[PDB]
Amino acid sequence: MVQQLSLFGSIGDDGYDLLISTLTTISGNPPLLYNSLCTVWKPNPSYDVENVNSRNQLVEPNRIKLSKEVPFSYLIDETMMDKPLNFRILKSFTNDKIPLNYAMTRNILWSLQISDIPAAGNNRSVSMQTIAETIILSSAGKNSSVSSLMNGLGYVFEFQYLTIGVKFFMKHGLILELQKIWQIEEAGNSQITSGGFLLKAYINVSRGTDIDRINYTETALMNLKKELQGYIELSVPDRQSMDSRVAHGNILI
Amino acid sequence: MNAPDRFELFLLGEGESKLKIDPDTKAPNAVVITFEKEDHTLGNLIRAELLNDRKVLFAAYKVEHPFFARFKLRIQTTEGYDPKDALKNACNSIINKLGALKTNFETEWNLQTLAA
Amino acid sequence: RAEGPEELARILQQLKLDKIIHVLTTMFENTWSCSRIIKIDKPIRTLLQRDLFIRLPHWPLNWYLILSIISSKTSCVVEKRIGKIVSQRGKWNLKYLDNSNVMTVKLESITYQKIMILQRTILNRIINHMLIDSLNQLEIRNKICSSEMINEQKLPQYIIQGSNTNDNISIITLELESFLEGSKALNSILESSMFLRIDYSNSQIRLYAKFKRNTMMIQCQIDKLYIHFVQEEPLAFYLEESFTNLGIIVQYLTKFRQK
Amino acid sequence: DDENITKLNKEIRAFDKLLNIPRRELKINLPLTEHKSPNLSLMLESPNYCNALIHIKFSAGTEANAVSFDTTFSDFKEVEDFLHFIVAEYIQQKKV
Amino acid sequence: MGKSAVIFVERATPATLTELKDALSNSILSVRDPWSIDFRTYRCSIKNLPADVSKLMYSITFHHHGRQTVLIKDNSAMVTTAAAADIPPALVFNGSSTGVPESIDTILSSKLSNIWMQRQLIKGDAGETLILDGLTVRLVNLFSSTGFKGLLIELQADEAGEFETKIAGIEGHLAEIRAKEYKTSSDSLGPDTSNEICDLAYQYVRALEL
């Protein structure tokens, strides 16, 4: 469980290369390639959860995220082994098509994660969100599989998507991510972040009670934002967009 | 209504230790031991047995409020002798006495049944 | 981080003591199973005393070779004994200790060859001691015919015959009254002392007795009773039997007694 | 994955033969008759880069896996003492 | 491949553990650090369930095996960790994990409390572990909410050739102490797939069931 303090933004791919150089001028570090695959699961509507205390609202149903890393050998087509595995490959990832299709992901079926809507009030300068996390290491039995496990808990699959981007590690534990997101269905693959990169700068705090640390984290994030003034505008997203409860449906992408 | 549940008299809550031992800061070789979910039945027996050890100086117990099931015991023994060891000896002696008592009662009851 | 001069002196004394202990424990293990679990409430009566309890997997149960290391400011000695210890309700109880056969050995003289010779002889010594303990459980008095006792030639010569300096032959002197559990009517017929000779190589048990008076019944044929009379001593006879398990030897004795 | 991390891993691994702990092993085979050839394997290591640890494995000519003795030593004096004892034991075995 | 077995004695006495510790004292080679174990059962709170779907879920927490939880349901196992040192480096690197996870028991009893609710809890603390010749034996007293429950014995060996003989020997050792009602188990969850801790948890479940 962490308090994640975050700021968001977006950029057009035209400046992409330039942006990268500037980051290396500041951090002093080179970018590192990465990828991931997230699957979202929701409580089964076939089961009537009368246990939701309607007269008191002790709790509301929520959605579970399962993440995993996928090797690049599934994301590189027959035209791309010649180039080395570095960040420049992202320049060729502008098409809505991608080597990883629905059948391979179905064949695949980790990190389990749950979150809450950010803190209310208009006196917050950065998006503060609470995250509860655990890890699944292995399994066994006659039906050892992620799908069977989540159906045993009482959850069913809803959708999935694939993230590819680069990471920058700066001082004080600040992490800056440049991402491209591909939604995947049997109908096909569609790039929601079409013609651009999604930028997200964030820090993690282990204990929410410590307030000196939280103040330091906010100071670092606002200093970073004030450093990038004039190039990219980093902003607090909409509090109602980062809500992932089942009752109301929307997805920040 | 504010009447507490009765089962709190014999079921320990989670995170509760049946014994708690604390050194006493006033007299050397003295310990205060808190027992939980217990009443005079055990404290009187243990104190009466601890009064038979020639190396035991002080042994006293109390139940501060008759609402809560718990009591305190206080032990002080001679130098070179541990109060926990005294408690262990007392419990062993009590157990042996109760076993002998049970065997005697069973023998007498069977003899009466033969004479019944 | 030591604080006191007395603490420093104690630290150095313990350094010497456990350095010697480690050296000898390594010597034993490079050839022996020590025990690091046994703690006795009272140190064994024989200046720092340390008790080490060693044994082998094939030894009889609860029988331990006990070494009492006595360390002084300038000299150190070792007391080697054989004991029996049991564990009951979380306590170590010294069931039995032997003091008549304490081996007091200087630190310097101990070597590997002495260690292996002691390993070979200790099995026979422990067998003799457990036979003694069993006879004590039977309340039968006994005495060991040690190497010095045999060399002194005070024992009957026919018993010494066949013992060609073999550790597999053990002779024990038993009291006639004790072996008979107080039967005083047989004291006037047989000698008060009998001899039990056990050969592990032959796995044979012989009970030798001596007639106090020359009875003419010896002239009669007593071959059907499995009694063999000594040619050297006509007043001396013996009963011979073959044994497979030592734990049942008591029954054999009764059989002998029966005969 | 990324070029930089693999490059650094390669460059660092290139120095293993220098940075790694030195080791040595010596196998001694003694010529004995009656198809009973004991083996004496002594491996010398420096786990903390300064201290000498000698592991001795002496296998008597009885079985291929029945290791007669397997010990460790940190004092060269005890090493010499045990070597002398082993030599004496071998001489006695050859005399019996 | 190592093998393990679990024997549970229900009619044991408070001093039976000491009796078995002393009765084996001849072969005891060494003793190691104490251990602990937790055993929870979670119940399904939803009533619109099919007949063939089970209602329980057994969670077993191992303290000595690096703080690991195992969830068991219908012969299906799941192994979760909660230590920062057990995290595969890929998940830390790519961003799939914040680096400081929580135990799955907190997740079940905090966020999913409207689907699963706790029903019991059986604990074992301050057990003893003994090294015998090619064997390791662990003993502990089980305490429920009410009080003492019984005795638990778990045996682990590396060589599987003579496991049955060792189990028979330990059973005989219990036999001389006149503990005649004991339930043992050495089953395997999956004949083809062999995971040690999952099989251990399954054996615990099979031993502790009523």
Side-chain angles (χ1 to χ4, degrees):
Chain A
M1 192 274 318
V2 294
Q3 295 295 115
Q4 200 182 105
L5 284 81
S6 52
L7 274 188
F8 279 67
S10 73
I11 207 168
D13 53 358
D14 297 330
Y16 163 78
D17 290 330
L18 157 65
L19 172 62
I20 284 299
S21 195
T22 309
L23 290 196
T24 312
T25 311
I26 295 305
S27 78
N29 276 271
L32 282 72
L33 215 61
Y34 77 91
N35 77 313
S36 51
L37 170 71
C38 303
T39 63
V40 175
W41 309 64
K42 92 180 179 184
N44 199 342
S46 284
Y47 301 135
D48 185 14
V49 287
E50 310 99 5
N51 298 114
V52 186
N53 190 358
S54 70
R55 187 170 294 278
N56 292 18
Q57 287 196 3
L58 294 174
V59 67
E60 270 181 335
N62 210 333
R63 286 179 190 145
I64 279 184
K65 281 169 82 161
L66 282 178
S67 58
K68 172 181 189 171
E69 183 140 9
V70 162
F72 287 101
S73 70
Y74 293 164
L75 315 172
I76 280 180
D77 46 352
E78 303 296 322
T79 79
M80 281 325 317
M81 301 66 68
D82 303 331
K83 271 198 177 177
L85 205 57
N86 56 348
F87 74 95
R88 317 175 175 285
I89 201 173
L90 266 294
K91 205 59 178 189
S92 63
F93 282 112
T94 63
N95 293 317
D96 305 347
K97 56 157 288 295
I98 202 68
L100 182 62
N101 50 4
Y102 176 92
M104 293 177 70
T105 76
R106 179 69 186 93
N107 275 345
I108 278 181
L109 313 179
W110 291 103
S111 174
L112 192 148
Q113 187 173 1
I114 306 173
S115 62
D116 271 306
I117 188 171
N122 301 333
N123 292 315
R124 203 82 69 170
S125 287
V126 301
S127 172
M128 191 165 331
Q129 192 167 3
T130 287
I131 299 151
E133 176 199 321
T134 187
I135 298 187
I136 311 172
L137 285 195
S138 64
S139 57
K142 54 180 178 182
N143 48 34
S144 47
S145 61
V146 166
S147 177
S148 308
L149 266 48
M150 306 309 269
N151 304 328
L153 295 199
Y155 281 57
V156 310
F157 182 81
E158 187 165 348
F159 64 90
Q160 68 196 15
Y161 60 91
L162 174 139
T163 304
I164 290 174
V166 301
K167 261 195 175 174
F168 289 75
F169 294 120
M170 271 145 278
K171 270 195 179 177
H172 320 310
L174 165 51
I175 296 176
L176 198 153
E177 282 183 348
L178 291 96
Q179 327 188 11
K180 282 206 153 205
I181 309 187
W182 278 271
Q183 182 152 301
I184 300 183
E185 287 96 0
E186 172 54 50
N189 315 333
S190 63
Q191 164 150 0
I192 312 296
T193 306
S194 58
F197 296 88
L198 167 63
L199 192 86
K200 161 176 174 186
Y202 67 98
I203 315 179
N204 281 314
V205 177
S206 43
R207 214 151 48 79
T209 314
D210 189 8
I211 289 174
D212 291 317
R213 171 135 299 280
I214 290 187
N215 288 355
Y216 196 46
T217 286
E218 263 156 36
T219 303
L221 279 192
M222 309 293 316
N223 260 348
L224 160 73
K225 147 174 154 165
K226 269 164 197 170
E227 189 47 47
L228 288 192
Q229 208 147 34
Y231 266 87
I232 299 99
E233 278 311 314
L234 287 154
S235 64
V236 180
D238 192 23
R239 186 184 158 277
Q240 278 293 343
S241 65
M242 326 187 63
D243 182 3
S244 58
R245 309 202 274 281
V246 172
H248 303 281
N250 263 336
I251 301 165
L252 174 145
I253 297 169
Chain B
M1 185 180 288
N2 295 255
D5 274 298
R6 302 291 280 289
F7 56 71
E8 297 205 3
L9 290 155
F10 38 87
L11 317 175
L12 283 79
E14 291 315 349
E16 271 305 359
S17 299
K18 184 77 142 207
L19 302 198
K20 197 208 160 186
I21 295 175
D22 199 1
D24 186 74
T25 45
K26 288 166 174 160
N29 271 266
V31 293
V32 185
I33 309 167
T34 312
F35 298 176
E36 309 269 351
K37 317 295 169 170
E38 282 305 333
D39 55 348
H40 312 279
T41 293
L42 207 74
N44 195 47
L45 194 40
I46 280 179
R47 195 255 317 161
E49 185 66 57
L50 278 187
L51 275 181
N52 284 354
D53 271 4
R54 296 302 271 121
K55 312 173 216 165
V56 170
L57 305 176
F58 188 90
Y61 91 102
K62 70 180 168 184
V63 187
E64 294 193 332
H65 204 302
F67 277 166
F68 322 118
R70 34 171 300 161
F71 82 80
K72 306 205 182 182
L73 177 59
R74 183 181 196 271
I75 310 174
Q76 187 195 26
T77 51
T78 42
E79 182 65 26
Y81 182 75
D82 291 331
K84 314 161 204 172
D85 193 328
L87 188 39
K88 184 176 161 285
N89 300 131
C91 297
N92 278 315
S93 194
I94 297 165
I95 276 159
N96 298 318
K97 278 163 188 156
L98 286 150
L101 183 45
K102 187 199 323 205
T103 300
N104 288 263
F105 180 75
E106 283 288 358
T107 306
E108 302 278 359
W109 167 250
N110 263 329
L111 189 153
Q112 300 297 337
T113 54
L114 282 155
Chain C
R1 85 288 183 275
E3 290 172 0
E6 313 186 13
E7 175 183 6
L8 188 153
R10 261 192 39 201
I11 278 171
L12 280 155
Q13 286 161 345
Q14 292 274 4
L15 192 147
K16 196 175 178 179
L17 181 62
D18 63 358
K19 156 81 164 189
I20 293 156
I21 292 161
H22 186 273
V23 165
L24 61 95
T25 308
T26 310
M27 292 305 218
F28 292 165
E29 286 144 344
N30 300 358
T31 49
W32 280 124
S33 50
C34 299
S35 290
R36 305 182 173 189
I37 306 163
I38 319 175
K39 266 197 183 180
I40 306 292
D41 313 328
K42 294 190 182 183
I44 292 172
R45 298 177 175 182
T46 76
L47 291 169
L48 300 177
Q49 175 193 338
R50 273 300 185 90
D51 48 346
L52 301 188
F53 309 77
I54 308 97
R55 80 198 308 281
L56 285 183
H58 78 277
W59 286 13
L61 298 167
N62 305 313
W63 277 108
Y64 299 74
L65 163 73
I66 305 168
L67 308 196
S68 287
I69 303 164
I70 308 159
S71 186
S72 70
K73 288 165 183 181
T74 58
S75 64
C76 183
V77 297
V78 171
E79 291 195 351
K80 321 179 186 174
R81 334 181 195 192
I82 297 157
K84 184 169 188 170
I85 318 185
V86 290
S87 179
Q88 299 152 341
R89 300 176 85 199
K91 291 178 70 67
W92 286 114
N93 289 328
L94 192 67
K95 191 181 182 191
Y96 160 76
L97 167 63
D98 168 41
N99 267 316
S100 62
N101 288 319
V102 171
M103 281 75 88
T104 304
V105 183
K106 305 173 183 179
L107 177 63
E108 306 177 0
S109 62
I110 306 189
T111 59
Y112 279 68
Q113 303 174 346
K114 283 183 174 181
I115 286 181
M116 65 182 179
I117 294 181
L118 174 56
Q119 169 187 16
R120 304 190 71 261
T121 58
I122 199 71
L123 175 57
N124 302 114
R125 300 174 180 182
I126 286 179
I127 289 184
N128 297 4
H129 273 93
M130 61 75 58
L131 289 177
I132 284 186
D133 212 358
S134 296
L135 290 166
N136 289 355
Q137 287 150 34
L138 306 163
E139 310 185 352
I140 300 172
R141 287 156 274 171
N142 55 6
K143 196 178 181 179
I144 287 184
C145 311
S146 304
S147 307
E148 304 153 4
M149 187 66 204
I150 298 160
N151 288 352
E152 277 182 354
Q153 289 180 331
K154 286 175 181 155
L155 293 162
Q157 281 192 353
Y158 47 87
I159 301 163
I160 320 172
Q161 283 180 346
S163 191
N164 271 351
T165 73
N166 264 338
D167 297 317
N168 301 348
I169 298 157
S170 299
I171 312 163
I172 301 172
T173 58
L174 298 165
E175 187 155 355
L176 179 75
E177 180 179 19
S178 76
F179 185 72
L180 294 162
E181 297 171 5
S183 183
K184 282 190 177 180
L186 317 186
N187 270 341
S188 53
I189 294 165
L190 299 192
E191 271 199 353
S192 49
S193 50
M194 61 175 68
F195 311 88
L196 196 71
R197 178 179 175 268
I198 306 161
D199 203 334
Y200 312 129
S201 299
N202 298 313
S203 293
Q204 281 173 352
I205 311 176
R206 289 186 186 165
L207 189 62
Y208 281 75
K210 190 160 174 167
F211 270 108
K212 281 184 166 177
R213 292 187 184 147
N214 199 355
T215 47
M216 61 79 71
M217 71 76 88
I218 306 176
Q219 311 167 355
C220 291
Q221 284 182 337
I222 300 169
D223 213 8
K224 285 180 173 187
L225 289 183
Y226 303 94
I227 312 171
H228 313 85
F229 281 80
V230 174
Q231 299 179 347
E232 311 186 323
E233 276 208 344
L235 307 185
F237 66 98
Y238 74 91
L239 292 158
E240 187 164 25
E241 274 273 324
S242 57
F243 87 104
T244 56
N245 191 0
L246 199 80
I248 305 170
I249 197 178
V250 171
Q251 281 193 359
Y252 283 110
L253 287 170
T254 65
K255 282 178 172 188
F256 286 137
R257 205 184 70 189
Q258 283 171 350
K259 286 178 170 183
Chain D
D1 307 341
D2 199 74
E3 184 194 354
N4 306 266
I5 52 169
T6 63
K7 203 161 198 174
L8 281 192
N9 275 355
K10 235 173 185 180
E11 280 158 19
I12 279 179
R13 181 178 288 174
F15 287 57
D16 286 9
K17 288 193 174 189
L18 193 147
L19 272 298
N20 270 329
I21 293 168
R23 277 92 66 187
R24 175 64 64 187
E25 185 193 41
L26 316 173
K27 277 182 186 166
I28 310 171
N29 304 319
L30 312 181
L32 276 77
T33 66
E34 311 191 12
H35 64 79
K36 287 196 167 177
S37 55
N39 296 341
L40 195 72
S41 66
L42 322 179
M43 61 285 278
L44 185 42
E45 284 94 352
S46 81
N48 52 359
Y49 282 75
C50 289
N51 298 164
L53 188 148
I54 300 173
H55 202 61
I56 297 186
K57 166 171 187 176
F58 165 55
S59 69
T62 50
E63 291 184 356
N65 281 322
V67 193
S68 50
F69 296 105
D70 215 346
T71 47
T72 177
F73 291 92
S74 63
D75 192 4
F76 51 90
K77 194 169 186 176
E78 306 164 329
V79 177
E80 295 176 26
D81 299 329
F82 193 33
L83 280 174
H84 186 273
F85 167 68
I86 290 170
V87 164
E89 281 313 308
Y90 156 69
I91 287 163
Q92 290 161 353
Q93 289 144 25
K94 208 172 186 172
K95 283 178 179 176
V96 175
Chain E
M1 156 196 79
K3 275 294 300 179
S4 62
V6 175
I7 315 166
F8 170 66
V9 193
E10 61 180 0
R11 294 271 151 61
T13 43
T16 298
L17 190 142
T18 302
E19 290 153 57
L20 265 294
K21 179 179 170 173
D22 65 57
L24 275 299
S25 171
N26 51 4
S27 299
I28 288 178
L29 292 170
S30 62
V31 293
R32 324 211 70 71
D33 276 293
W35 64 292
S36 312
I37 197 159
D38 295 13
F39 182 99
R40 284 91 178 278
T41 70
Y42 290 88
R43 286 290 304 255
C44 184
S45 62
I46 301 164
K47 311 308 298 302
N48 290 318
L49 266 287
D52 71 303
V53 176
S54 183
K55 298 253 181 56
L56 285 86
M57 209 195 54
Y58 306 103
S59 181
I60 296 89
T61 296
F62 298 100
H63 296 270
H64 48 287
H65 287 89
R67 179 66 65 192
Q68 281 180 355
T69 305
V70 176
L71 306 94
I72 302 296
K73 178 182 207 310
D74 268 333
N75 302 65
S76 303
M78 199 190 144
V79 167
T80 77
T81 198
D86 300 355
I87 299 169
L91 302 197
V92 161
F93 170 73
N94 67 2
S96 292
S97 161
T98 47
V100 292
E102 294 193 325
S103 66
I104 201 68
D105 273 327
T106 285
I107 301 297
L108 276 296
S109 314
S110 171
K111 303 265 192 167
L112 311 190
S113 44
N114 60 6
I115 319 175
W116 304 96
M117 64 211 191
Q118 190 141 359
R119 186 71 177 81
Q120 271 94 17
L121 162 53
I122 308 173
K123 213 179 303 195
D125 193 2
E128 286 277 31
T129 182
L130 321 171
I131 295 179
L132 313 163
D133 169 38
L135 203 60
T136 303
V137 182
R138 287 196 167 86
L139 309 162
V140 73
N141 288 290
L142 283 192
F143 284 150
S144 49
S145 168
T146 288
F148 176 88
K149 177 84 179 315
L151 184 74
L152 181 88
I153 301 168
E154 71 94 20
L155 322 169
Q156 184 178 2
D158 305 339
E159 202 272 340
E162 286 84 355
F163 209 72
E164 299 87 354
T165 313
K166 305 168 164 185
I167 297 169
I170 292 290
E171 285 182 12
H173 273 91
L174 277 296
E176 291 90 6
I177 320 295
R178 303 162 182 162
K180 292 308 283 166
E181 292 180 353
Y182 53 95
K183 185 46 78 157
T184 184
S185 285
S186 58
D187 296 333
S188 186
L189 183 45
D192 312 321
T193 52
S194 79
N195 208 342
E196 51 275 2
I197 190 167
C198 314
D199 278 305
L200 180 64
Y202 185 69
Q203 282 151 349
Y204 269 79
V205 158
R206 298 301 326 164
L208 258 63
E209 53 83 28
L210 288 168

